[PDB]
Design a protein around this nucleic acid. Structure first.
Lengths: 177, 147, 96, 55, 356
RNA sequence: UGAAGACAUUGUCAGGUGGGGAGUUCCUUUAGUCCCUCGAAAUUUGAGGCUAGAGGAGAAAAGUUACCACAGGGAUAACUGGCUUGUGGCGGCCAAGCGUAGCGACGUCGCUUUUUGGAUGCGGCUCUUCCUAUCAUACCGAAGCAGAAUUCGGUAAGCGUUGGAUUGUUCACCCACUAAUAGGGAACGUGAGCUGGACCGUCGUGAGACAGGUUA
RNA sequence: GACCCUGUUGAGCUUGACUCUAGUUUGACAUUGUGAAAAGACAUAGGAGGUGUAGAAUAGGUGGGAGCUUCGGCGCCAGUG
């Protein structure tokens, strides 16, 4: 493994602040004098406890395949892409939320965009290109993405209309099987 | 073999539906985005998620083949065996990745019912077979076992 | 989190104010209900961590990984008013 | 018919038609003998007398 | 030949073996009768002579016939709920509302739920994709309830290929502690990592090391689980090749590796643990060379390990003796699980304390 | 001088890791002797070891892909036209021959395939003329074809060739009159008549949007 | 429609030397005492022991053994291992 560099952590925190509300909560120290850290193994970043990372160093580089929760990967062009594996953190501290009925929840898992015919609840005053985590009617985190229009435009929108751009969904777990 | 099978018996949505769902989710259809492969293929698992690299290749239900007619030369016999995996198509790496079955195509076939005794005293449970017909013209797959 | 903290407070706070706290929590259960029923039904206790009492932030203290066990003292508090208030709390929890 | 639906050329359609019509023929050639047996029994029943069970 | 005729002849031979003294022949003996039954069952059930003979020595006639009928019949569906996300009552309610037939697997596990028939694919349900339940087996449930892991401990899943056992460990440790999940094949570690990330586990370290370099790499784990690679004579339903692809050479190489693995686990645990010094050895086979002889080897080559009560609801005790070899008397504490008695995949479990 | 306390802290050897700092330019496979050790089961194995082939300037970045999205460049720009129709493909055996191993028709054997009886996702109506690959009518040949009702085949286009249910439409199946209630062409515009978008610009892009402009 | 190439991008694969080393981490040992109460393993001396299958039968195990004898019950012998 290797800790993130300053620019790499700047990029990762830019994306994380795009999708989440508070981040000092993530990097806050815990009761037992332990804290969460960020590490990179084979152009993947992993959110993991410092104790777990320090006990995972005994593993040789070629043999470490996972550690904690995989947030995403840094691409060859130097940009961070977030993952459905990083969805749980997003659910914990999400900024904007979008609830979808079953009729759109199943398509969202199949890998389709969210539609006004699917939306069942909004978050008031959501700007155009903002960070919204997609849940179902049972408050179960289903995915995350960036919304298409604002709340007013979505309300005025044709019900057969795109309201959210899909970026990651729980169906990729059915892929990596 | 057939009596053994008979006594043994005595003892998700399709990619077209998924594509229609994605289309209902997405307003604008890019021209020619739906790229259906018009060749017979083998898939295996009933429901799976494909990589975004290959999420544009649609393999139709009517063209999916799961079972083939394999001929053993040394013991001259033709038996119907299930296909395990498309191993190599000497025409296109894309074809062998999508599992396209063409003429002269190396595939893995289950020979469990045939009962081949090997050198180590094993029992054969998977062997290479070369598809030697044109499944695109003939609604069947004919292969010869490389044994 | 606030329900758990207010139950602990009402346990450790004088009689009339404790009666007020029990009334407020009864109103909270009336308004929300299904959201907080898990705090008293132990079969729905989440196991995604451990409760941190002396936390620093509301989200940091995992509220659904714990159970409100205080009743076992506030039913034997010396004041009939708080005792009947807790009785009303359980009554409406039951009539959820 | 499904394969013909997904056909892409006249040669493919011709081979698919030829295959379908020939596969049905092979089936009949398998059903040679039962047809002969049924013809024989048909003739014998057509020649059987009428015997009324309850008279 | 006529395998229905052979089924009838097997039934006749079984009754003859049951009542040889009363019902007999002029001079035909038990040896001839059991040899004919061996050939009969090898022919009809597609078992090679070696393995078929081995299982025939394993069980009394009636029980052997039941065992092989069970091995021909598949197991029901069973799922494990994530205590990290939901609980059994709500999960069952949601699945029934979605239209699948479930009911609790028994009174021995509070986290398991048996499924009979379904209208929606079980691995495509929104709760499954959200990580609410996992398609595991009850036999796989057993080893973790043998090794219940407490919170804030170091656990070593020495072979965690599927992932169900590691996720269940995480469930019982409440996403606390450190779990070293090792799997010696990248391809299957891919599915391991996928399952971990789907079920929402944050305390896993996935390694691709040979499971025998562990006292060298880390050492000193509080608890270890060792699901030893075996001959597979307990999942013959799922893997039909085992019926005729297991020979003497195999039953000599497999146990040597298992014995080395058990020694590695013993050396990897610590004797001075504040909460637990436990090794749990589990095996998917039902053969004595695969099962409890490695336990005897462990108790014979490491005196500082003691076999302890398994704490599992049901099962049959281990075999103190077999055809010639006598084991340690304490081996009776171990438990054996077979399909014909209990509708579960055939396993063996063993729990050990480290003292030195 | 007080408090804490046999736990810490601390030290040493053995290792694991090392994408950070300083300096310089090991495992896996193959074959062999049954040569040694190490494990394991007892009447044998697995792992190291020996010999020599094959795998793995250097934290800056690099190579690669019949894949993906966007942008661009190039070639092709319609198309079949003595085409089409009734008999499947694969492998073995036989096989006059050609040949002097290779190609090889018809048949046969094996798979499909057997010991008990909805598909479809532009349609519909009227009239002229032509074809026959004939539904009826005329005449024939064959059939356990007694009679009757028929079935198959042949010459025959002279003469005629409906209505329902259902479905977005059509066919299949089913139901009613009838002698029967056949199939097609009018030639890339299915004879005549009637009826039921692409370019630019802004902002984006893990994504599209514009009562922004122009235009056939 | 389709096909080939280039640029950027995504997805994936491969490579990115060696020796010490900070950091990190595992095991053992040591300071280092006085006692008391518990547990384990070493010392004897005893006492008691074994139910997979079948075999009448709860077969530690090995060694000899065709005869053993509170002189009537046993062995061997036939099994079944």
């Amino acid at each position: 493994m290797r800790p993130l560099t300053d620019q790499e952590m700047k990029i990762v925190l830019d994306k994380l602040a795009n999708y989440m509300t508070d981040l000092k909560s993530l990097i806050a120290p815990l009761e037992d004098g332990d804290r969460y850290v960020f590490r990179m193994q084979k152009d993947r970043v992993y959110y993991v406890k410092l104790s777990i990372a320090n006990i995972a160093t005994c593993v040789a580089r070629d043999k470490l395949l996972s550690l904690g929760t995989c947030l995403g990967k840094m691409t060859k062009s130097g940009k961070f892409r977030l993952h459905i594996t990083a969805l749980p953190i997003l659910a914990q501290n999400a900024r904007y939320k979008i609830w979808v009925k079953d009729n759109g929840a199943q398509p969202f898992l199949y890998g389709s965009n969210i539609v006004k015919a699917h939306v069942g609840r909004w978050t008031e005053d959501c700007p155009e290109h903002s960070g919204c985590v997609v849940y179902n009617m049972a408050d179960i985190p289903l995915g995350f993405g960036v919304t298409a229009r604002s709340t007013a435009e979505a309300r005025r929108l044709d019900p057969t209309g795109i309201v959210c751009f899909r970026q990651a969904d729980c169906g990729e777990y059915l892929r990596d099987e | 073999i057939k009596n053994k099978r008979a006594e043994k018996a005595a003892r998700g949505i399709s990619e077209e539906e998924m594509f229609k769902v994605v289309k209902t989710g997405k307003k604008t259809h890019k021209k020619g985005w739906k790229r259906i492969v018009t060749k017979p293929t083998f898939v295996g698992p009933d429901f799976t998620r494909r990589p975004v690299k290959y999420e544009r290749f649609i393999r139709p239900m009517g063209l999916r083949y799961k079972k083939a007619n394999v001929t053993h030369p040394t013991l001259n016999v033709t038996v119907q065996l299930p296909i395990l995996s498309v191993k190599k198509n000497p025409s296109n790496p894309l074809y062998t990745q999508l599992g396209v079955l063409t003429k002269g195509t190396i595939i893995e076939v289950n020979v469990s019912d045939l009962g081949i005794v090997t050198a180590s005293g094993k029992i054969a449970w998977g062997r290479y077979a070369q598809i030697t017909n044109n499944p695109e013209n003939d609604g069947c797959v004919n292969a010869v076992l490389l044994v | 989190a606030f329900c758990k903290q207010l139950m602990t407070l009402a346990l450790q706070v004088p009689e009339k104010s404790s009666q007020a706290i029990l009334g407020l929590l009864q109103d909270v259960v009336h308004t929300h209900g299904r959201k907080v029923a898990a705090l008293w039904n132990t079969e729905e206790r989440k196991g995604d961590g451990t409760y941190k009492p002396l936390s620093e932030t509301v989200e940091g203290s995992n509220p659904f990984t714990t159970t409100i066990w205080e009743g076992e003292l506030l039913r034997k508090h010396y004041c009939p008013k708080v005792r009947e208030g807790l009785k009303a709390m359980e009554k409406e929890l039951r009539s959820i | 018919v499904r394969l013909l639906k997904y056909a892409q050329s006249l040669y493919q359609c011709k081979q698919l038609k030829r295959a379908a019509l020939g596969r049905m023929a092979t089936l009949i050639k398998r059903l040679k003998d039962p047809l002969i047996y049924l013809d024989q029994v048909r003739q014998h029943l057509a020649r059987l007398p009428d015997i009324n069970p309850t008279t | 030949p006529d395998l229905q005729m052979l089924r009838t002849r097997i039934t006749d031979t079984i009754r003859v073996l049951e009542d040889f003294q009363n019902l007999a022949e002029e001079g035909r003996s038990r040896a001839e009768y059991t040899n004919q039954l061996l050939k009969d069952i090898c022919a009809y059930y597609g078992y090679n002579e070696y393995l078929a003979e081995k299982l025939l020595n394993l069980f009394p006639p009636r029980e052997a016939f039941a065992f092989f009928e069970a091995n021909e019949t598949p197991r029901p569906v069973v799922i494990r709920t994530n205590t990290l996300r939901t609980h059994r009552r709500d999960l069952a309610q949601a699945l029934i509302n979605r239209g699948v037939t479930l009911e609790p697997v028994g009174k021995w596990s509070k986290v398991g739920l048996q499924v009979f028939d379904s209208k929606v694919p079980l691995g495509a349900t929104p709760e499954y994709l959200a990580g609410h339940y996992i398609l595991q087996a009850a036999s796989s449930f057993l080893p973790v309830m043998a090794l219940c892991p407490q919170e804030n401990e170091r656990c070593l899943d020495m072979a965690a290929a599927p992932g169900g056992k590691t996720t269940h460990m995480a469930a019982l440790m409440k996403n606390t502690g450190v779990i070293f999940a090792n799997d010696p094949s990248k391809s299957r570690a891919k599915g391991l990592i996928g399952n971990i990330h789907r079920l929402g586990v944050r305390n896993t370290i996935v390694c691709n090391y040979d499971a025998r370099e562990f006292p060298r790499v880390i050492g000193g784990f509080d608890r270890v689980l060792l699901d030893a690679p075996c001959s597979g004579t307990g999942v013959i339903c799922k893997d039909p090749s085992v019926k005729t692809n297991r020979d003497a050479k195999d039953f000599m190489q497999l146990p040597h590796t298992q014995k080395q693995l058990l020694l590695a686990a013993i050396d990897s645990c610590n004797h001075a643990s504040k909460t637990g010094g436990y090794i749990v050895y589990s095996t998917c086979s039902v053969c004595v060379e695969e099962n409890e002889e490695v336990v005897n080897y462990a108790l014979s080559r490491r005196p500082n390990v003691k076999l302890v009560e398994t704490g599992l609801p049901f099962g049959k005790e281990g075999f103190t003796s077999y055809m010639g070899k006598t084991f340690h008397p304490s081996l009776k504490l171990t438990r054996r699980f077979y399909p014909h008695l209990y509708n579960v995949d055939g396993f063996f479990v063993a729990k050990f304390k480290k003292i030195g």
